[PDB]
Amino acid sequence: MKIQKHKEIYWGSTIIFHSPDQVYFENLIASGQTIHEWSSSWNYQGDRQVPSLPLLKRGRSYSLTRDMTSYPSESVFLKLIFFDRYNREVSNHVERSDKMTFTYPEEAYSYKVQLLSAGVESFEFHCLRIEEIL
């Protein structure tokens, strides 16, 4: 195998896959609802929905970055949820912008990031980026 290294997080139903690194979308999704979700964990053992997001360190601080453009401009939001070991929520941050900095809480066992929605007509999506900051 060649494995195809990259440190970016890709996408993985008008959802059109014009490339691994670019995805088209047309609205179907209520304002406030979820357009997509990434998780650092399996929802249940059998699940064919495999984790996408890397393991994080507690107390440390990171930068979550969208690389996408939404046709009705500032329409797609970016929610970030931290869950504990019992699957109960811990905390949630939403960001209108395309960059966000959070500090990974010390109760957090896993995390998910969702793309939420304002009135979104269409978007082109490239990726997410997480790197450690200070």
């Binding site: 060649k2 195809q4 440190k7 890709y10 964990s41």
Partner: protein, 517 residues
């Protein structure tokens, strides 16, 4: 600072090689550890600590994480051997491997079957957390290759198959170039010439030699002067590692029952003489050592481990008293004991029952299910097992049967559990640890270091008395609470700064004994 050298092994003859197991064949043998207990103490009470890993663990990130020590700094023998430079993890999707164009995929509920032009090409299996764990490769209905993936997102290793048998395994670098090759027939390990820069010796006879090499080189050239080494007592002899320790350093030797229950006291003599400090998680093993080796009695101390992944129990937020009843299915079924519990739950309509079965395969779970159905049908009424939620609004029952595969499984189940019953002759050790950790009382048939009679739980004479035990904690609030108290002030004096304090004090007390001669 403090260095920890864990004993994290495989179960084969290659002990330095951790087992690779698909998510479904997964079963519970104890993964929590005296080491993990200790390292966790250093991370709260923020002290500096580092981990020295001598074993091959392609999936060690999820392991550390799952065990709540992901933030610990580690040096890894096989990370040097394979020239893994960055700890950056890229969670691999199947989509980005990638395969030939003709490959079609078929999704088993267990794995993924890749066929190309109708012929079986590959099985893609997953690990308990859901990352690609390994892929089997096929050439004409014959297994030829096995790729083992690193949880950081590359091919860590390849096993080659001759006539359907392991012949050879080479360990790649994250770029794909083999660095060492290991021959698995009785028999050595060869270094790839291109990378001779990083290995003194060009070939090694047994794998532990190359291991012993890289480890000692770290301890000599990279350890800050006067440090402290906590060594998990490995199954055989500790000379391998003890005789690599600095001239000026303190050594702590740590004994965990699950690991060292079976060891003859005679071969301990060498390692027990060297060690500055000795720790056991069993009182009577401390005593066994203090009698056979009376000259070193003073340096052996008892320390009980506790899993702090367990939040304290939220069973006060429930009207229903939930009962966790443990069944070891390697012992077959015991109709008398299953019935005494089923009968107690029938009588007290304010209770729910989870029957936690471990060491069981899919079909053995069904056996437990039928035996419960049967016993209920023949002697009781199934209608008395319908839950309030369902019959106060009118199917769903007050009892169900859960397969306990993970420790995580059990941790979840214990969150709202009010009472633990284990009627085996050897009670699942992790459940005893998890029980006292979450502050839930326990009923066992044999005494232990985690359950104190009429304080922490009840120690039954025979299962005939099961109701007297059950009542003691299920009836009223007083006893159940005097037990949360007892359990809490026992979690306290075994996971504070207090414990490391006691270690430093015990190290000073071991010097003041040397001056006596």
């Amino acid at each position: 600072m403090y260095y920890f050298i864990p004993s994290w092994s495989g179960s084969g003859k290659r002990v330095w090689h951790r087992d690779i197991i698909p998510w479904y064949r997964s079963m519970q043998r104890l993964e929590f550890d005296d080491t993990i207990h200790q390292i966790r103490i250093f991370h709260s009470e923020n002290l500096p600590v580092k981990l020295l890993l001598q074993a091959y663990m392609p999936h060690a990130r999820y392991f550390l994480h799952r065990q709540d020590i992901f933030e610990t700094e580690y040096y890894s023998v096989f990370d040097e051997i394979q020239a893994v430079e960055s700890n950056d993890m890229q969670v691999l999707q199947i989509k980005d491997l990638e395969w030939e164009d003709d490959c079609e995929f078929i999704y088993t509920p267990f794995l993924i079957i890749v066929r190309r032009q109708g012929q079986l090409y590959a099985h893609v299996e997953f690990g308990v957390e859901g990352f690609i764990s390994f892929i089997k490769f096929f050439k004409d209905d014959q297994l030829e290759k096995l790729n083992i993936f690193d949880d950081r997102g590359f091919v860590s290793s390849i096993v080659y198959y001759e006539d359907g048998q392991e012949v050879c395994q080479d360990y790649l670098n994250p770029n794909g170039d083999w660095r060492i090759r290991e021959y698995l027939k009785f028999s050595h390990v060869v270094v790839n010439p291109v990378f001779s820069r990083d290995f003194d010796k060009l070939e090694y006879e047994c794998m532990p030699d190359l291991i012993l090499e890289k480890l000692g080189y770290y301890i000599s050239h990279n350890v800050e002067e006067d440090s402290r080494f906590v060594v998990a007592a490995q199954p055989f002899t500790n000379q391998g590692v003890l005789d690599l320790l600095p001239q000026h350093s303190h050594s702590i030797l740590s004994f965990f029952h699950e690991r060292n229950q079976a060891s003859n006291i005679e071969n301990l003599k060498a390692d027990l003489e060297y060690a500055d400090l000795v720790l056991t998680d069993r009182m009577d093993f401390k005593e066994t050592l203090q009698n056979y080796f009376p000259l070193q009695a003073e340096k052996i101390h008892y320390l009980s481990p506790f899993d702090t992944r367990l939040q304290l129990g939220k069973s006060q937020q429930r009207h229903e008293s939930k009962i966790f009843y443990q069944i070891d299915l390697s012992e077959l079924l015991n109709d008398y004991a299953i019935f005494k519990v089923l009968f107690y739950v029938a009588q007290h309509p304010d209770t729910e029952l989870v029957i936690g079965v471990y060491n069981a395969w899919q079909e053995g779970i069904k056996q437990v299910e039928n035996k419960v159905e049967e016993l209920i049908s023949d002697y009781l009424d199934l209608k008395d097992f319908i839950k309030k939620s369902f019959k106060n609004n009118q199917l769903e029952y007050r009892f169900r049967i859960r397969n306990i595969t993970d420790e995580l499984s059990l941790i979840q189940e214990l969150d709202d559990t009010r009472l633990i019953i284990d009627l085996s002759q050897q009670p699942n050790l992790y459940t005893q640890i998890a029980g006292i950790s979450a502050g839930i009382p326990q009923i066992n048939l044999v005494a232990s270091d985690y359950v104190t009679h009429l304080q922490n739980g009840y120690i039954l004479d025979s299962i005939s008395q099961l109701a007297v035990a059950a009542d003691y904690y299920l009836q009223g609030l007083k006893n159940w609470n005097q037990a949360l108290i007892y359990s809490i002030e026992k979690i306290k004096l075994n996971t504070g700064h207090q414990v490391i304090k006691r270690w430093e004090k015990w190290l000073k007390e071991a010097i003041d004994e040397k001056v006596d001669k």
